[PDB]
Amino acid sequence: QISVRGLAGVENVTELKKNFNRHLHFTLVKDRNVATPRDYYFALAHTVRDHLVGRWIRTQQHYYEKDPKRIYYLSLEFYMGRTLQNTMVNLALENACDEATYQLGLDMEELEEIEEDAGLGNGGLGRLAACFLDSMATLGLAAYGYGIRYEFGIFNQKICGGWQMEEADDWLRYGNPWEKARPEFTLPVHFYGRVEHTSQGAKWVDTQVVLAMPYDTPVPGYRNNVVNTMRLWSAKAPNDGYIQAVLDRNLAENISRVLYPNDNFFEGKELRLKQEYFVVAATLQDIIRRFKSSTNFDAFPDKVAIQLNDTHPSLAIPELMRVLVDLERLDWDKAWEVTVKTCAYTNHTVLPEALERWPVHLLETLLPRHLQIIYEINQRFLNRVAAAFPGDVDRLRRMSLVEEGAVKRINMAHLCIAGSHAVNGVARIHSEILKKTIFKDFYELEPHKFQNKTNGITPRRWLVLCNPGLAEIIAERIGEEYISDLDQLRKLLSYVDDEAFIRDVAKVKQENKLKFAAYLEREYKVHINPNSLFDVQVKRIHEYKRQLLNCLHVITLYNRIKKEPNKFVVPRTVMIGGKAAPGYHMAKMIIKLITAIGDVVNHDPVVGDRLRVIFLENYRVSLAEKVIPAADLSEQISTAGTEASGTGNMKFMLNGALTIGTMDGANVEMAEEAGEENFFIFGMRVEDVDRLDQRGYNAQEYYDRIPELRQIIEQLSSGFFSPKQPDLFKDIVNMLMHHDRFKVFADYEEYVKCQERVSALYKNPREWTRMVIRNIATSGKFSSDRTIAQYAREIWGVEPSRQRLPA
Amino acid sequence: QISVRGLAGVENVTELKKNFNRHLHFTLVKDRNVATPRDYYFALAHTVRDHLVGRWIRTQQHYYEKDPKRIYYLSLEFYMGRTLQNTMVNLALENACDEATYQLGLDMEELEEIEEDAGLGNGGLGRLAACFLDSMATLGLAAYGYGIRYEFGIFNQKICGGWQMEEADDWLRYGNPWEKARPEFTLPVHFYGRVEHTSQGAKWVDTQVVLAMPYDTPVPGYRNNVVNTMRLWSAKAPNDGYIQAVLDRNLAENISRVLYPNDNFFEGKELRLKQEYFVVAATLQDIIRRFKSSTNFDAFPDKVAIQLNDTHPSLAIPELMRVLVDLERLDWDKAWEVTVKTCAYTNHTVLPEALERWPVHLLETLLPRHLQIIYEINQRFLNRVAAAFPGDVDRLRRMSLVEEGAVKRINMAHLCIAGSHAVNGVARIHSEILKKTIFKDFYELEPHKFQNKTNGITPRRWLVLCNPGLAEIIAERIGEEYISDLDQLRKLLSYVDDEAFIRDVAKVKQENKLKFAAYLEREYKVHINPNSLFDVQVKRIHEYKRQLLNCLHVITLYNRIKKEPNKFVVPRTVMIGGKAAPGYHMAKMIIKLITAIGDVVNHDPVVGDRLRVIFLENYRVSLAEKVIPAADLSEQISTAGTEASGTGNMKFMLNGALTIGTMDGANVEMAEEAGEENFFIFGMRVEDVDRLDQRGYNAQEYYDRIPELRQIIEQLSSGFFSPKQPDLFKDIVNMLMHHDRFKVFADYEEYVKCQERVSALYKNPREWTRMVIRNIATSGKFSSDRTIAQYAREIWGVEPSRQRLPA
Ligand SMILES: O=C(COc1ccc(-c2ccccc2)cc1)N[C@@H]1O[C@H](CO)[C@@H](O)[C@H](O)[C@H]1O
Ligand SMILES: O=C(COc1ccc(-c2ccccc2)cc1)N[C@@H]1O[C@H](CO)[C@@H](O)[C@H](O)[C@H]1O
């Protein structure tokens, strides 16, 4: 049908048809009389997976023969989403499968909706790992993702009476056709026990053992016949009343049972520490085993890079030291040099409550040898600080890996900086904040360690897969090369005055919106107007992300309409979606407020279809692929200095939405790429926030001086949005008035004014679309291929390649 | 190589070779460079499984079109063993796979040793279910086995310092290529809750729900293209702190976690009751759903038979009543008629401590509605007893389903007799004991219910598979037909004086023994003499089975040798094997005594290789397939009246061992088939045991009058077999002397005399072999094809068929 989806040759179609019938018969043990749509999905999945295997085997054989430096990306999260369509895209099989299934009397799109998301992450950090794997394979790097095979991923969110309810994400129920169990590569992981000292050095003895069983999933590059591996570890009890002893095997296997969903506010839970060590200990044994199959650990950093995705796998540092010192018997200083040259650390936040700080008593009991090593690392590090800054005793206390207080804690960020040759933030402003404020002491001691690597997204999933219509009108003008060289989109700047292109860009957006409006009714019985501006904010629910500020705007618009009902306003559909961490009361209250506003707004006859407020239930990778192509306006409105990068912002820019946002995270670089005239920037900059903090933020001042704001607060307090429970929202009002760390009121006026400018532009479709073209055309920087090429050259010491492997 | 293993045609071999390479590549994702022997096993298993699928689909389609009466065999145990070789045998693929693998440079026998036993049973009752499934498929019955998919089967037994140690049988670790998950056929099972009464009748409300997920395994008939199903249920939590709630899903899924290994002494454990209801509730919903796919439950017994394998699934009776009365709204009397006509019950013991008697308080809490129904069944039944036997108030108390006492209990055997149209024992003497003693009252009320169905074994696994050499020398003389018509073995009576046949029978036995002697060294570093008489007792360890009596004989022989070392004796290798239930102290002590005797006997220079005592570790289906073909003498020495049938006895008879045994269980019918002159019968009959009980058994009398017996007891008491712990065996001596329910001393003299007659005959190889021929030739009765034909005609009301389905 469309060019970018590939060829549908007679030979290929015929072959796909027979392999499909073969799998339906031999694999599923069904015939056409009893097969359900799920059986058809599986027959298709196995058919496509068969095309991966030859390339997977030869890629791995290739790395063995050529022995390149290997990249190990350690993450506790891989937010993969669905795999079927992505695999077809990357193997150029999409049109052929479409044709083949069509001939068999099946709708491929319908079969695609059957696949469960692999929801093995919370949000941005987990999805970054997934984009990164795609880019590493597309750039021909010998790269391995290592993580945990959680039995239950991020919870499914249901909304009941306006409230979030959580249910278990039982994503493996029907089986996973993409993974291959490797029970033969099983490895032991140790816990508890005690440390004995001999003449020969230290020994860790009397440990309990959990087995780590690997499951491999193929990661295909974009049309280069490269297929890399993501290896996910699963916990198994070793084989040694009788009944109860058997049932107690559950205790061990609980390590890989469920993903922790609390992506704000760190809590030191023992089971999470076990997960963190488990992935690290099994991964490092695998790495070392592979390195030996090439005595001389001097060459170890020439053949191994380990990237730590935040501090979650930070135990890699003392575990690598443990193995080199206790098992391989290297002297400390040589082991340390190897470790530092091997490890690099990516930081993802600045909120103090988000940093991992493990109580010493937990490590003492669970990992007694690791605690000794961390103490030794700390002593040697602080000796270096003392020599560089003699007499500065407060610096010594600020930089220590060990924090004193009620309970002594280990600061895992400080461990990571001490034991890595490179530390990076995820956007230019974030990396600068790291050097200037939270890791200032570390930067002064070792300035060469600190880098920036601005985040990106893969244009395969986030353009070609989710928005084929847009990908096609672009390919028509500039060819197909841009799909793996996104900087080529700049060529589109010469079409900004092209009448045909303007019309096509606008037509694709209209089609995406009609499709999404239809999805909403069929699957959720909700009525929307497709001619309205689609105003969307989708991301995890956090105070810093300021869903609340968006709420205030929605109510302002509603109040204005009620005040002057016969005045024309640009119609809007305001959609907000995102999950709240189960323990986060304020985030759960924000969800309830959103639905409560909807209840009032959506049923007010005076409003009509001029304003609609919808809460997008169960936001996840598959839903983002649907809503992002349909968006006109992207809400990126975190308080300046709080969102380290953002990546959802990039997805929207690539797909033809305009952005309203603060100068925060990657928004700054996006505005710089597109030109500030083509971006809706508002609000305090980081400097303005600092000045407010120096003086003291008083929310009352805003309430006193802004009549429209005072009206919203009275409506909330008095029960306008909760008639049967008038004080339902008192916690929200109280926080806004007295303890708002994120200064919601301070940006309110500028935000409302800026939103008026959005509505003005949307009235002029031709000029709206021309601004959209200038955004799409300057989105090239934010390809994760650019990000990974910078990691490879500036951190890993390896050269990317665009060359094909033989097919 | 050998005729009965089938054809190896050029077309077949070539096709098997390519499908093997296809599975190795696409299924396992390996090539020849990294493949382990386990990968080769799996490639072969998937290749053979592919041959089943077409026949499996068409068999099930056939039953749908023809709508025959369906047989549902409900068992908590299916002791299946390995599947690969059995599937090849039944599909006539054995020689072809052998050739194909040989050409690929592989040894098929070696690949066969890689497969885990499906050890989903304890011993005889579980293995009977497995033989029965094979016979039902071979006889063309529309039959379904229904059970539980245990994650952990019968424990692996290790012997450490002479003691049994139990380890988890993690049989699913590497995956099971034979099963197909059917997540779409998942069904809810209810527990706990309470009973509400309306106008409409009773309602069971506020229940907790566990899901039952089915896994189907194909059951191939012998060369008839019939493939039936064994459906095994697995427990899954329904989908509705957060972390802990996720981890608590284990509680629900524990129902199908582990097989209970205590096959003597019933213990009322709540988790076992849940297992019993779980299999019954899910199975009956499946049965009813299938019946509806044909209002009129009158025809239900014309289209459904349910066979209960002991009382373990006895809850089928009140569950069927519950469904018909509460859900389908049938009146009680009509529902009851349907139930009785549908259900039949097979009894497997006479030991009072083995009968299931569930405490009422357990049923009250777990299954409140079932307890009401059982009470109602009991009231109506006892009303019938009172009318038939007016004034006999003690009969009323003896026959009640409810037993009074400390705790009130339900007698599940009484429930089963009341709610079944047929009750059978498993050997002629057992069925007679049922009518005359333990169920006498029930027989007097309803004599037409009571039947005999003498047990059998499948000659496919138990001759063709495990002893191809013997199968071949038989096929040479009489053709291949006997494999599915075992009565044809009688034709062998005309070869009893045939010199060539005598030599061939003896040669096959010698080859089996050389092979087994070699297996022992290679896998267990133990040295045996292959010219000795192989004296074997393999079966679960129980006092009633009298491994202890065998122990006394072994010590007698040892004492005799020590007494007269230069006198010739027929050399023996005495092998004893079997698992003890984890809670059974005396059985664990018997295992230790056996190894302790071995320690002394096997290292005494005076003995030489004239006597060896070996404990066969980890006895299970795969080991029985090795040791049974190698045996000369089969020990079947239970106290008269205690072994309901035995089936191991039949396996030995079919494979060329002679039998030393009591007139107990099926031994009686075996001796009757072969002629008593061709059997080594000794000891008390049931009548002699009764007379002893009337007078009172005094073990001291035997000890006083038998000097050789007194010597053994002093050796045991004084520490001759346990030098470092002189009183190790005091419990054994104490039991023998003071509380032996199984009268070990009373049979001792006759047993020793009889064993002398065995040794005399073995000295004359020609006459030994002629007696063997007369045993093999009269073993036809004990084919499970005969047993199943009698069940089908006399209980299920269906006609077996030997006709092929189209291929
Ligand atoms: O997604 C995250 C953080 O997610 C988690 C996920 C899990 C945890 C966690 C930590 C300890 C224990 C349990 C859970 C903490 C944070 N951060 C985002 O990372 C993106 C990629 O760099 C950035 O674009 C976002 O700005 C940043 O908020
Ligand atoms: O194997 C058995 C009994 O096995 C079990 C297995 C499990 C249980 C059980 C019962 C309740 C709770 C837990 C376990 C009780 C008995 N009996 C044998 O059945 C054979 C087949 O009919 C006969 O040949 C044997 O004589 C008989 O002992």
XYZ file of N, CA and C in Angstrom, chain A residues 502-557:
168
model
N 2.158 21.303 2.626
C 1.312 21.883 3.685
C -0.024 21.130 3.832
N -0.696 20.913 2.706
C -1.957 20.184 2.660
C -1.821 18.712 3.105
N -0.749 18.056 2.669
C -0.470 16.651 3.018
C -0.124 16.498 4.499
N 0.724 17.389 5.019
C 1.052 17.365 6.451
C -0.258 17.495 7.259
N -1.099 18.459 6.887
C -2.371 18.683 7.589
C -3.353 17.532 7.442
N -3.346 16.893 6.270
C -4.225 15.743 6.019
C -3.839 14.524 6.863
N -2.542 14.265 6.970
C -2.069 13.153 7.796
C -2.479 13.333 9.270
N -2.352 14.558 9.791
C -2.752 14.860 11.168
C -4.261 14.643 11.354
N -5.051 15.138 10.408
C -6.497 14.944 10.474
C -6.874 13.471 10.464
N -6.218 12.693 9.616
C -6.470 11.240 9.587
C -6.094 10.554 10.910
N -4.977 10.967 11.508
C -4.537 10.404 12.802
C -5.536 10.701 13.905
N -6.084 11.912 13.884
C -7.077 12.341 14.872
C -8.420 11.608 14.700
N -8.873 11.427 13.459
C -10.115 10.667 13.185
C -9.993 9.228 13.682
N -8.831 8.626 13.449
C -8.543 7.268 13.884
C -8.552 7.175 15.412
N -7.917 8.136 16.077
C -7.874 8.126 17.538
C -9.232 8.392 18.182
N -9.999 9.312 17.601
C -11.372 9.611 18.034
C -12.278 8.386 17.928
N -12.011 7.552 16.925
C -12.759 6.324 16.702
C -12.347 5.243 17.700
N -11.051 5.185 18.019
C -10.539 4.233 19.002
C -11.177 4.502 20.354
N -11.360 5.778 20.674
C -11.920 6.181 21.959
C -13.360 5.696 22.151
N -14.199 5.855 21.128
C -15.586 5.385 21.198
C -15.686 3.855 21.265
N -15.103 3.171 20.283
C -15.161 1.708 20.200
C -14.669 0.988 21.459
N -13.595 1.492 22.059
C -12.958 0.811 23.182
C -13.292 1.416 24.545
N -13.871 2.619 24.558
C -14.173 3.306 25.820
C -15.477 4.116 25.848
N -16.322 3.949 24.829
C -17.644 4.615 24.749
C -17.638 6.101 25.150
N -16.658 6.838 24.636
C -16.519 8.267 24.933
C -16.563 9.110 23.644
N -17.358 10.186 23.664
C -17.633 11.013 22.475
C -16.779 12.286 22.372
N -15.915 12.352 21.354
C -15.103 13.557 21.097
C -15.285 14.179 19.706
N -15.041 15.483 19.625
C -15.105 16.239 18.385
C -13.730 16.282 17.705
N -13.606 15.669 16.509
C -12.287 15.566 15.865
C -11.788 16.869 15.228
N -12.617 17.908 15.196
C -12.167 19.210 14.694
C -11.575 20.123 15.767
N -11.584 19.647 17.005
C -11.043 20.430 18.111
C -9.520 20.279 18.141
N -8.853 21.198 18.826
C -7.418 21.102 19.063
C -7.174 19.984 20.108
N -6.315 19.023 19.775
C -5.994 17.916 20.685
C -4.834 18.314 21.596
N -5.167 18.588 22.860
C -4.273 19.168 23.850
C -3.890 18.035 24.825
N -2.664 17.530 24.705
C -2.326 16.314 25.441
C -1.105 16.397 26.350
N -1.303 15.864 27.554
C -0.246 15.708 28.520
C -0.227 14.267 29.008
N 0.702 13.473 28.490
C 0.830 12.078 28.896
C 2.248 11.795 29.393
N 2.335 11.216 30.585
C 3.596 10.981 31.298
C 3.180 10.514 32.713
N 4.099 9.924 33.462
C 3.793 9.559 34.847
C 3.282 10.766 35.682
N 2.403 10.494 36.648
C 1.853 11.558 37.506
C 2.824 11.917 38.644
N 3.322 13.152 38.628
C 4.262 13.656 39.647
C 3.950 15.119 39.884
N 4.103 15.572 41.127
C 3.973 17.000 41.387
C 4.893 17.843 40.499
N 6.153 17.429 40.319
C 7.087 18.246 39.525
C 6.662 18.413 38.065
N 5.912 17.442 37.543
C 5.466 17.496 36.149
C 4.269 18.458 35.965
N 3.606 18.804 37.071
C 2.600 19.879 37.097
C 1.358 19.660 36.201
N 0.865 18.420 36.170
C -0.492 18.136 35.732
C -1.469 19.128 36.395
N -1.164 19.528 37.634
C -2.007 20.488 38.368
C -2.129 21.852 37.693
N -1.035 22.335 37.115
C -1.062 23.610 36.397
C -1.983 23.539 35.178
N -1.919 22.404 34.487
C -2.788 22.118 33.353
C -4.248 22.105 33.825
N -4.512 21.437 34.953
C -5.831 21.482 35.584
C -6.347 22.898 35.826
N -5.477 23.791 36.284
C -5.902 25.160 36.557
C -6.304 25.856 35.260
N -5.573 25.574 34.178
C -5.887 26.175 32.878
C -7.258 25.708 32.377
N -7.500 24.397 32.470
C -8.757 23.802 32.051
C -9.935 24.474 32.758
N -9.821 24.659 34.072
C -10.873 25.307 34.856
C -11.048 26.786 34.471
N -9.936 27.488 34.218
C -9.976 28.878 33.728
C -10.814 28.998 32.444
N -10.580 28.086 31.491
C -11.293 28.078 30.210
C -12.773 27.820 30.430
